[PDB]
Amino acid sequence: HHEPLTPADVHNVAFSKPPIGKRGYNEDEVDAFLDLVENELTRLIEENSDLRQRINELDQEL
Amino acid sequence: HHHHENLFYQGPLTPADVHNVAFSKPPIGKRGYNEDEVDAFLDLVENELTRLIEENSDLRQRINELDQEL
Amino acid sequence: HHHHENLFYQGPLTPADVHNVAFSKPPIGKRGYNEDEVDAFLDLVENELTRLIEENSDLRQRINELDQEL
Amino acid sequence: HHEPLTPADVHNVAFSKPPIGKRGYNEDEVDAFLDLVENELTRLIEENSDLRQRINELDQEL
């Protein structure tokens, strides 16, 4: 864990309140959707690096 | 890459989902998140997800071409 | 309630999303979840989400009718 | 936390492996989607009970 947009950016984004006196977006909904986002960016980055590793192995055999 | 290629990607979150996700208003009389900031952030999300899915598809195409050469 | 009423619900997960969500296969050469079991579970999810959104809409209609009577 | 389908059922569901020798569904994807599911069922149940509370308050005023 400690070694354009990153999963960490999604984890850390912080939003202000709506203007006076607006209401804004439900925070539970936005939170839950951003958790899906963070999970899927992370998984795609890991899977992309695995494909890249496989590519490396295949080039070494070429 | 282009703006309207079907890459036949299978996963539970697509750029179209990010683009179309809807949020209700908060429970009254709590307030929620600033809508401008969330909208702008989700545009960046749509862009990054698009790029990673495009990268996924290209790495898979390259692996198929290699697997052909081998 | 019926099977094709637009309740104008706003939220980030709808019955249609549950119905249409797609999953890729696992990273090779790990295996994943049984597809029959996941499919059946997600049908129950689609049903429960539908019922709760319908309940949400009826409670809101009742609150509007009360707010009219007051 | 300790007082048809429940959020807890989503939290606890456990799936077997695919048949020999099938591959099945990606587990990171299913996990992340079930987390969104659990979150949204929980939030709708809480919000529904709040609407019901408001209804109670309004009937008391009728």
UniProtKB/Swiss-Prot annotation, chains A, D:
Name of this protein: Cell wall synthesis protein Wag31
Annotated localization: Cytoplasm
Free-text disruption phenotype from the record: Proteolysis of PbpB (PBP3, FtsI) upon oxidative stress in depletion experiments; degradation is prevented by overexpression of Wag31 but not the 46-Asn--Asp-48 deletion.
Coiled coil ranges: 33-62
Function recorded in the entry: Important for maintaining cell shape and cell wall integrity by localizing peptidoglycan synthesis to the cell poles. Protects PbpB (PBP3, FtsI) from oxidative stress-induced cleavage.
Portion of the full sequence shown: 2 to 60 of 260
Signal peptide, first to last residue: none
Entry's family note: Belongs to the DivIVA family.
Miscellaneous: Was identified as a high-confidence drug target.
Post-translational modification summary for this protein: Phosphorylated by PknA. Phosphorylation enhances polar localization, which in turn heightens polar peptidoglycan biosynthesis.
Gene (UniProt): wag31
Induction section of the entry: Positively regulated by the stringent response.
Subunit structure: Forms homooligomers. Interacts with PbpB and CwsA.
